[PDB]
Design a protein around this ligand. Structure first.
Ligand SMILES: COc1ccc(-n2c(SCCCN3C(=O)c4cccc5cccc(c45)C3=O)nnc2-c2ccncc2)cc1
Ligand SMILES: [Zn+2]
Length: 208
């Protein structure tokens, strides 16, 4: 029961999402192997995701987390990257399929850095690249990220050297302990704690 509302480039809501999309690009330590080499995106379209059942699922779980955390859901707007955003905008997030392990264990991954989410669009470590050119840095094929509303509540703070929640926590925060430039990543283990608000269709742009 999902509806997609295409946003005009003139809409204030379109510009504030693209802005967040463009300004959260950062240099990547891996030399762009996973997500490709680029400094900015070409936004082809942004779509608002509306689904009543999914929203109720989210707000319901949000109320429970909030009451377990001094009335603080600790809600963020985070980017999500994976090759399943097509099923997700219809079926919503589902922790049952989130068994693939990452840097911070298994679970559903989000990031403040859009370019970090871009790394996982075509699979873990970029997979084998786009289905058509097998190029992880393809400048032609379309990519899709979700700009989601996520509930973090009491989040366990994990530091890196750069599946259920920890007892008494509703999520996990992944933070670099030396590179203060890389923004945080987040992992949740309840599909109900994330709602995909926006669908961003884009291409990475080849630097000049
Ligand atoms: C294929 O390579 C990947 C790429 C991204 C993920 N992933 C995922 S997959 C997307 C979330 C889980 N999930 C699904 O994986 C999923 C797959 C197929 C159909 C679905 C229908 C509804 C809901 C889902 C799904 C769903 O919720 N979440 N975090 C990661 C991740 C990101 C970065 N590092 C580690 C894990 C897992 C595997
Ligand atoms: Zn391609």
């Amino acid at each position: 029961g999902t509806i997609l509302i295409d946003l005009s480039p003139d809409d204030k809501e379109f510009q504030s999402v693209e802005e967040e999309m463009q300004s959260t690009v950062r240099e990547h330590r891996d030399g762009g192997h996973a997500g490709g080499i680029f400094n900015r995106y070409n936004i082809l379209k942004i779509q608002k995701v509306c689904n009543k059942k999914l929203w109720e699922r989210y707000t319901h779980r949000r109320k429970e987390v909030s009451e377990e955390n001094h009335n603080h859901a600790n809600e963020r707007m985070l980017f999500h990257g994976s090759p399943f955003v097509n099923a997700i905008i219809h079926k919503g997030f589902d922790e049952r399929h989130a068994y693939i392990g990452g840097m911070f264990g298994a679970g559903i991954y989000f990031a403040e850095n859009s370019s970090k989410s871009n790394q996982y669009v075509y699979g873990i470590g970029g997979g084998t690249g786009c289905p058509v050119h097998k190029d992880r840095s393809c400048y032609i094929c379309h990519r899709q990220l979700l700009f989601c509303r996520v509930t973090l509540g009491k989040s366990f703070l994990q530091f890196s050297a750069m599946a259920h929640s920890p007892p008494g926590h509703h999520s996990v925060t992944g933070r670099p302990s030396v590179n203060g430039l890389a923004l945080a990543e987040y992992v949740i283990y309840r599909g109900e704690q994330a709602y995909p608000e926006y669908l961003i269709t884009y291409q990475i742009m080849r630097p000049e």
